[PDB]
Design a protein around this ligand. Sequence first.
Ligand SMILES: *Cc1cc2c(cc1C)nc1c(=O)[nH]c(=O)nc-1n2C[C@H](O)[C@H](O)[C@H](O)COP(=O)(O)OP(=O)(O)OC[C@H]1O[C@@H](n2cnc3c(N)ncnc32)[C@H](O)[C@@H]1O
Ligand SMILES: CC(C)=CCNc1ncnc2c1ncn2[C@@H]1O[C@H](CO)[C@@H](O)[C@H]1O
Ligand SMILES: *[C@@H]1O[C@H](CO)[C@@H](O)[C@H](O)[C@H]1NC(C)=O
Ligand SMILES: *[C@@H]1O[C@H](CO)[C@@H](O)[C@H](O)[C@H]1NC(C)=O
Ligand SMILES: *[C@@H]1O[C@H](CO)[C@@H](O)[C@H](O)[C@H]1NC(C)=O
Length: 498
Amino acid sequence: PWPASLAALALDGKLRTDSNATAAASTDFGNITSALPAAVLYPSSTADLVALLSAANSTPGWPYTIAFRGRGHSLMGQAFAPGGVVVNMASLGDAAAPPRINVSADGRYVDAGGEQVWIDVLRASLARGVAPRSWTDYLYLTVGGTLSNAGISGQAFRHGPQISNVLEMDVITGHGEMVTCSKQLNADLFDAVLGGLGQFGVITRARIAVEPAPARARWVRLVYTDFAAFSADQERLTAPRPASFGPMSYVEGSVFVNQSLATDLANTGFFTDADVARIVALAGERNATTVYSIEATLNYDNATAAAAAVDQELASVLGTLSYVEGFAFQRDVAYAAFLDRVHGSEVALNKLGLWRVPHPWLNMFVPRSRIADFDRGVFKGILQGTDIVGPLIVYPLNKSMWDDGMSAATPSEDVFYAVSLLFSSVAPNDLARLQEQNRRILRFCDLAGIQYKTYLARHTDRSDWVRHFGAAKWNRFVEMKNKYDPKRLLSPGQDIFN
Ligand SMILES: *Cc1cc2c(cc1C)nc1c(=O)[nH]c(=O)nc-1n2C[C@H](O)[C@H](O)[C@H](O)COP(=O)(O)OP(=O)(O)OC[C@H]1O[C@@H](n2cnc3c(N)ncnc32)[C@H](O)[C@@H]1O
Ligand SMILES: CC(C)=CCNc1ncnc2c1ncn2[C@@H]1O[C@H](CO)[C@@H](O)[C@H]1O
Ligand SMILES: *[C@@H]1O[C@H](CO)[C@@H](O)[C@H](O)[C@H]1NC(C)=O
Ligand SMILES: *[C@@H]1O[C@H](CO)[C@@H](O)[C@H](O)[C@H]1NC(C)=O
Ligand SMILES: *[C@@H]1O[C@H](CO)[C@@H](O)[C@H](O)[C@H]1NC(C)=O
């Protein structure tokens, strides 16, 4: 027997069971795993989400698991509800009125629907001359989606991840209750949801911190053949100064294996063919099996003197660095063009049919004390003699900017690196080889005693999830699961309680 509000959803054609609806909600960006749901919900308002969740909590013996599909950018089925209900979150922003993105009157924050995509949040913010401070590398992800993970890019060293830039949220819990939460009101829910992997409820609104919007970004790449010099410089650029950070707005890095050096440098979309030839020659002179590049930006406004001031600030910063003499490469773009840089890769890759392919990506957080060991064992070790398709990204993060009371798991050290090995599969023989190579990398780390944390991955064993969060932090995670999703129906694709 169905409650009136739940039956109303089916009657209005919002709760779909057809082949076309279930098939779209059964695959993800990973393109490795699949699971068909029993039903797909297309909510028109947040009231439709209250209906589904309150029914689930009131109905005894309710057998349907519920997932919240943002953009389905998940790698391993985290957004699926096998034989359950998939919420097509994007349907919340169908009606042009009322707007789902609203910049505050004071210009200090932006209210965004949980289903909203970061690219839309950027356009609506820029219209009011402001912008969020902390991003993801790719903008076609949802607010609620990135917030359930962490949300990291080159700005996270100084502003913390996206989870550290939220004032408050509207969350519909597993009980079906609409709860507004922050550090002052319902803090236990607020902390649980942020990096909470969709286990405690659905985010319908997030209040995101903004800053005055810069007009342009001076964008630089610095080349190294020495890992010690590369990592020391990334740490110098991101070091807290005697809370306070240096002049750089964004700091990331790239690893290039010698075998496909020329191809991979050309595929950055940054280097010219003249730059590529110089770097390839440098590699050969140094007899390097790997090349490294720091990617950094300096944000600046439309001011008349700004460009000349940027040249002097950049010259000063570069003078403190140890990249190979004369291997500094500069570009100058509009801020939105820099932020949306990755969308261009999606368009080109999809047209070649190389976007909707398996993505056995390896993403982890490695403590700073073990990064050189990771470089030897992985970049100069395991990965050598293999044909790599996709970028290899490495950059440091400051633990002081992460809130350990939140759900997201990080290493114990003050400095840790985001390590993102973004492999794209070329054939089924290549998929199995890549999946085995990831197991080998993790086995190498475990045997070397490297205390890493995975990011964007879902564990299949209970002992692995307990090690992920840490035993004490696991106890709080369970305490919160019992308070907000006692029936254990939310985001079953994480394989934590399902
Ligand atoms: C595909 C991709 C992903 C990606 C990226 C680049 C590409 C091409 N670059 C990233 C980066 O630079 N930094 C970063 O932190 N992450 C990056 N990612 C990964 C991305 O964060 C994840 O894929 C993430 O899941 C967000 O994607 P999406 O918005 O598409 O969400 P989902 O995959 O459908 O679901 C993720 C889990 O969260 C739950 N969920 C989703 N929305 C909500 C809301 N509103 N409230 C509560 N829970 C929610 C889903 O149930 C699922 O468990
Ligand atoms: C933590 C995670 C999952 C991060 C994922 N981010 C990215 N995902 C996919 N492609 C990327 C990413 N960053 C840069 N590129 C492309 O990589 C090259 C950058 O050198 C360019 O082609 C750029 O567009
Ligand atoms: C992967 O994508 C291809 C091409 O779009 C499709 O044939 C296949 O079903 C997908 N596999 C999974 C497991 O999602
Ligand atoms: C780099 O790769 C090329 C083949 O692309 C090879 O001729 C050269 O020996 C390699 N250098 C090192 C140092 O491994
Ligand atoms: C060049 O590097 C390769 C691989 O690291 C090694 O086999 C060789 O000893 C090096 N050659 C010289 C002349 O140092």
